[PDB]
Design a protein around this ligand. Structure first.
Ligand code: HEM
Ligand code: HEM
Ligand code: HEM
Lengths: 679, 323, 682
């Protein structure tokens, strides 16, 4: 049980009488009043202690990544990796460490939709026996800006406009594209955010990245440069934009509910942890500077080396106390790992410590149960708001004769202390500059776009077309087009069509045809279809429902979550047409006999909005899902102009439909149904 | 200009050089580094004062009504109402008073959708020459509960489940309908929220209500019981649910954008302020108790008297600083 | 062990390596620098995490009573008091409940002197098995004002002037006496603070009072009005003002050290819990309104009835986490107790809950280890800054089908819930007024002054003289004199002498000769001299030290704490003359041979300030202490003009001095040494 250590702070209220927060049993359903229809009395301490705590429930949301959800689990190391790091949680084969992971968007506030288009956070804490180690990463391997001093500028430009606070959880507005085009470094992460990575199917279908180059350090101080990678065992998968928009309305909680259900049903998601390892003398060997967080390292140069695996198998018990309160920091480093002079990472170390002072209003947030390490805290820190401990050592200073030298100093040679990589040097003038090695902002955006499938490329161009068409300022749109043209003339021409602007002349300085592996989503079928969702459209009339149940029981044998839909909640019906939407499902199949709700009187009912069954099947088809009908229900496919000849369309007897849908779920999205520019 | 008094705190940065928060011109696009490809120095006060302010930008959202939007305007009294109240802002015909109004949903957090189904807030401040007078109202004339001590129970049951924080800005989950069926006082407001009042076309197309009976008091102490009413001059209008759902995703900001656009285009919305006035000895005479906020007073028993009109005609300059 | 429940939060750092606050062993004695003489790196996460915690150590001091000190202990009920109260901690003979008590002054900030003249706080938490019960009391039975809405006015006027923040921890300034004379209800507490109660010898030598009338309520709901009393088993004892002033400079920690020392040495202090009980129908029957907090109830009308005894026997382990962080509230009430319509009490209930949000910056302060009940917290409260628990019940609301009704409602007949006194009624118009029964501001101040000994009365007049003579505004002083004259014409005339003002005419509306017991300090000797301190003045030359060591040993057998003083820390010397002062001791004894340091060569030495042995003996005498000299050391007494047969002066052989000094410590202050008005007349 990854949550074992949290048991001592759990409060069970079963069978208990109500109390105040200072003890004593109470009733708290009536205010104390002066007479029968009288005024409430100041001396009602019960009322005021109850409402004061309510009045003060909220804490500030995170300044970025406010919308998110998390879970507990276990990391297991596959080896004794002491030859590359002194880090204790990687120090022995099959060694296990509890983790907590929080996934998030970036721009939107708490309560904004999961399926907004955005960069996604992927933040992991390892509760190691030598301290908490956080990998505070994203689902995209590069970041918008090269120097941390620019983060407020990026964030202000992307977050709502400060006069009217519009728009929520979106980059589709003037200020964001003004920044992206004025700060061309941002183009690489932008292209990723415009790809499938900006609208992932679920947290469980994301890869993760530390982004920055770090250092792994052995006991003797020898170091390797390292990039962290999480590789999802579920495979990467993405929505399409027109689907994500509706889903944002039909279920803002789509991703946190997906994670929760997967864990509750015993389908815990997993990621392998992998590293790229680079000798120090190769930091500038691959066409760019590994100190530069706007570039990633192509796997052709350094393959992913698997170190272990993480499985998230415990949901939290109280969201606020665990998920909302947890405080990640890239400065949560342990012996065997060190920083690099990445100017974005460098400033993150200050910001994450400082920002907890705002969110937790005090310096003792590491004493919160979800933040405590399992390894023991021994230092001379005292006092501060909410101090939860009582320290025994009176001589709270060092050095000291009176405390006999305890707590004692630890370094590289004694006490397994942290130490900075021994060979790191500083040289040159103190400067407010960036290295000229950071100056190429166009090659890797072009490399990324090159490495996607043709329809996948069309998704990127359509995201840009959608977003940039919201920019009211004409010159900003021209500036965007000028910058895009430096990545690919063809991308610029195709975007310019939507904006009504002239196709610019080629600017070939950075054009190239290179491709690299591992950045595409849609070029790979899924390794499993477990937990994927099938919507079975049925009806309460006739014998369709008994057939839907048979269909459901077979699909569930393959680990699918199956929802039988009908006009009302008859026996065997999981959901009404009123409550149902295609966005909830990975495949839609019409049970036999249910064609009667796709036209005629069966389609006109007070129990659901007009056309709802046809809209669900139309949506499912147009969003690229496997769709199907059993037997006579093929007429439902015809009613919307879909033919069985199509890829990802299945008709016929029950067993043929199950096999087709189950193979279609591995393809996941049928890109045949999306038009490409000039095709 | 309703925002006239706020011009003295307005800061114009056009044509200026960047400064720290304690003055002195700066550049703040590069961290100070120890060498060309070097670490950032702790002595870069410019970096840290800029990032400290960013790190500390957020404050707690309101415990309820966290999602909302507002604007400035003017209230004008239609008469000298001194015969029913000593209130200065109602003391002369054509007397003008600056207002600010914030509209809101109730359950959802800061970034939830405008077109969630919910009760809606309608809070008005009168900046009167005898102090600030707020009417903190809703777009529905009755409330769920009869005693303030039950507010945390109501709110906890409607807000997301505390184990996984699902569902956002919605009563369609077990705990909410557990509370509504266990605390039957809630059925009246529930029915209102289930009607078009729960999914209005815009803020400008809602009425507003004080809900509670208050008192109006004259100079010599004569009192009347009063219900406050805002009657929209734009007319009441609502969406249908299946459209509200898609709108929550296509444009979470639908209502705040609508308000902003109407004011900016010079189509300032208006509301009449109106009252029902009841004698003290009739507090229990209309088939219910007027101290009971789960009941409204049918207009057939006490018609509205119109006190004046409010027009919202200026958007804020900085949402955070004002709204 | 009263601290037992706190052992689960105690952190032992011995034998451990240094860590950060998120774990991982470190060194934290050098900043990370870019080169040998380089700038410090922002990536030094160890530096910043250490200094961030330091930079954020302080929390706001308490808005009043900021200066104080506390300890843990045990309360033992003397019987089953269910016939007067359903309160569980009073429910059975010999039932024991852990307590924490914090004593305090009122006006001074966190670092002000213990022996400032002030009212003193006396706040007790009972960690009962039915919730935390606090009696938030003072060492004086009456308060300055009658309505809580006036508390900011009182406190603003007594605290330092808001332009220059002068004076610290004192009422001797214009605004305080402007308030006292403009708000005459204040005069009664004023007289008490001008008496010995303003400058007590220690926290252990104070009585305590809840002040307000409260209610005790039985199971069936019958009630009695009650006044709470703490009666110190050590006896009441007080300093004199000229001594308390020097002590504020020579040891600002005198009271908190005294308490800490008493407990570390095994001399735990005790107080008995006593009540006065009044029938509900007699609330207005004793010449005043028992809802009036500016009045006390004479013991001649209702005698004290002892319910139990409290003993403080454990010091805190971390002062900040325990003493500083503890949050008292008169709203910390339990079943069997109820409030009254005392308009001062009513507003306190609001104030103490609200002020915790400022001092603790969040609503979860009852989760701090020192504030936690021992009886269990079960409700639908959630979230908030610093939430320390993880709640299991996801149906956090009532009423509810889904949580099966749990946590469940508790009331008078179900679940031993709190309940308001059943008979209480409200009647009449909503009003912003005070009952006319509250109107008499002078009779009880006169009763108090009448009940002190003659020299004790002179101490009160001399404190007023001292304080009022700091008032620069002439009319304020005349205002003070007119108000004093309504209490006693002789008091006003004796005060007016110091002020150079005219003796006012008698104004006899409130004059009377009544007296009451239990308000004096100096008319009763101490019941024990345990922990009292004897300074033995000795010297390093000759045989004095050997004799002084024998004197100390015999005196220690009687429970006294003895300090042998000499020029330097020779063998057997506890303290140097340079470090010593009469204020630290309750008796001063010159060891034989030490007359050498009272004149001639021995008196002028580089090792201590000129005249210091003589000054210690002079202060000890003039401040009323027992003073003595063994054998030839009688010349030290002669050298300061003290005669050997005076009261409280003992000379002779070792054994007679020990006996005389132990007897004189029971008297404690020898009041024959203080002149009373009229003594100097020719
Ligand atoms: C490689 C670049 C970056 C990555 C991968 C990243 C990732 C993340 C993630 C995953 C979170 C959410 C942690 C959680 O779930 O609680 C977060 C929050 C945050 N980030 Fe970053 N971020 C990056 C750049 C930056 C920069 C440059 C700054 C400022 C200098 C910054 C400041 C913050 C702050 C203040 C928070 C809120 C933390 C809290 O309140 O607990 N981030 N970031
Ligand atoms: C007639 C019934 C009620 C109405 C019409 C009402 C209306 C409102 C409105 C419109 C707001 C948002 C104002 C804004 O835009 O800033 C609000 C916020 C709030 N309400 Fe109510 N409410 C009612 C009942 C209650 C009750 C019974 C309580 C608690 C006893 C309560 C506590 C709060 C709190 C604490 C806030 C947050 C205000 C802030 O942080 O500024 N409400 N309410
Ligand atoms: C009979 C009258 C009063 C008595 C016996 C009394 C006693 C005390 C004591 C002993 C303390 C310090 C508790 C400690 O050691 O931590 C205290 C603090 C305090 N008192 Fe009173 N007081 C009285 C009147 C008032 C009134 C009328 C108010 C306001 C309406 C008030 C407001 C406060 C506040 C805000 C604190 C600070 C509490 C904290 O920060 O934890 N007091 N009082």
């Amino acid at each position: 049980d990854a949550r074992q250590r949290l048991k001592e702070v759990e409060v069970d209220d079963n069978g208990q009488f109500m109390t105040t927060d200072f003890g004593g049993n109470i009733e708290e359903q009536f205010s104390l009043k002066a007479g029968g229809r009288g005024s409430t009395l100041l001396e009602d301490f019960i009322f005021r202690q109850k409402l004061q705590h309510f009045d003060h429930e909220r804490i500030p949301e995170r300044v970025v990544h406010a919308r998110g959800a998390g879970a507990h689990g276990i990391f297991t190391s596959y080896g004794d990796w002491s030859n590359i790091t002194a880090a204790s949680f990687l120090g022995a084969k099959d060694k296990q460490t509890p983790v907590f992971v929080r996934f998030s968007t970036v721009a939107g506030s708490r309560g904004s939709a999961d399926t907004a288009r955005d960069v996604h956070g992927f933040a992991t804490r390892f509760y190691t026996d030598e301290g908490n180690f956080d990998i505070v990463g994203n689902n995209i391997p590069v970041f918008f800006i090269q120097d941390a001093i620019r983060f407020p500028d990026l964030i202000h430009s992307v977050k709502p406009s400060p006069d009217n606070e519009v728009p929520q959880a979106a980059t589709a507005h003037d200020s964001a594209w003004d920044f992206f085009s004025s700060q061309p470094s941002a183009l690489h992460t932008l292209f990723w955010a415009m790809s499938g990575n900006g609208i992932p199917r679920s947290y469980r279908h994301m890869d993760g990245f530390g982004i920055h180059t770090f250092r792994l350090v052995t006991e003797d101080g020898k170091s390797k440069l390292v990039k962290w990678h999480w590789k999802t065992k579920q495979g990467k998968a993405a929505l399409v934009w027109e689907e994500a928009q509706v889903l944002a309305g039909k279920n803002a909680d789509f991703h946190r509910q997906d994670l929760w259900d997967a864990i509750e049903s015993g389908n815990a998601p997993s990621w392998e942890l992998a590293v790229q390892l680079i000798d120090e003398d190769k930091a500038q060997a691959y066409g760019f500077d590994l100190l530069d967080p706007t570039k990633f390292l192509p796997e052709e140069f350094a393959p992913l080396q698997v170190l272990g695996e993480m499985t998230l198998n415990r949901n939290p018990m109280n969201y606020f106390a665990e998920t909302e309160q947890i405080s990640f920091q890239p400065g949560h480093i342990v012996r065997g790992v060190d920083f690099t002079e990445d100017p974005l990472l460098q400033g993150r170390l200050y910001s994450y410590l400082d920002t907890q002072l705002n969110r937790h209003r005090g310096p003792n947030f590491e004493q919160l149960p979800i933040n405590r390490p399992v390894s023991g805290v021994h230092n001379n820190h005292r006092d501060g708001q909410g101090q939860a401990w009582i320290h025994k050592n009176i001589h709270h200073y060092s050095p000291s004769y009176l405390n006999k030298g305890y707590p004692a100093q630890a370094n590289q040679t004694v006490g397994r202390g942290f130490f900075t990589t021994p060979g790191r040097t500083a040289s040159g003038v103190l400067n407010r500059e960036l290295s000229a090695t950071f100056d190429d902002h166009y090659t890797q955006p072009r490399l990324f776009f090159n490495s996607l499938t043709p329809v996948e490329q069309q998704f990127v161009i359509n995201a840009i077309r959608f977003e940039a068409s919201h920019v009211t300022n004409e010159q900003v749109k021209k500036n965007v087009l000028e910058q895009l043209n430096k990545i690919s003339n063809d991308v610029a021409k195709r975007v310019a069509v939507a904006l009504g602007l002239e196709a610019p002349q080629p600017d070939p300085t950075y054009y190239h045809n290179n491709v690299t592996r591992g950045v595409s989503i849609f070029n790979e079928s899924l390794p499993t279809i477990a937990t994927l969702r099938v919507g079975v459209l049925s009806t309460t009339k006739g014998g369709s429902l008994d057939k839907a149940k048979a269909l459901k029981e077979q699909l569930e044998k393959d680990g699918l979550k199956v929802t039988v839909i009908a006009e009302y909640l008859a026996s065997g019906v999981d959901q009404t047409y009123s409550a149902a939407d295609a966005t909830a499902f990975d495949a839609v199949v019409v049970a036999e006999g249910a064609e009667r709700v796709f036209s005629g009187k069966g389609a006109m009912s007070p129990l659901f909005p007009a056309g709802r069954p046809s809209q669900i099947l139309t949506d499912g088809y147009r969003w690229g899902k496997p769709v199907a009908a059993v037997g006579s229900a093929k007429k439902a496919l015809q009613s919307i102009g879909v033919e069985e000849k199509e890829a990802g369309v299945y008709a016929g007897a029950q067993d043929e439909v199950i096999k087709g849908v189950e193979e279609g779920l591995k393809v996941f999205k049928f890109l045949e149904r999306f038009a490409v520019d000039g095709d």
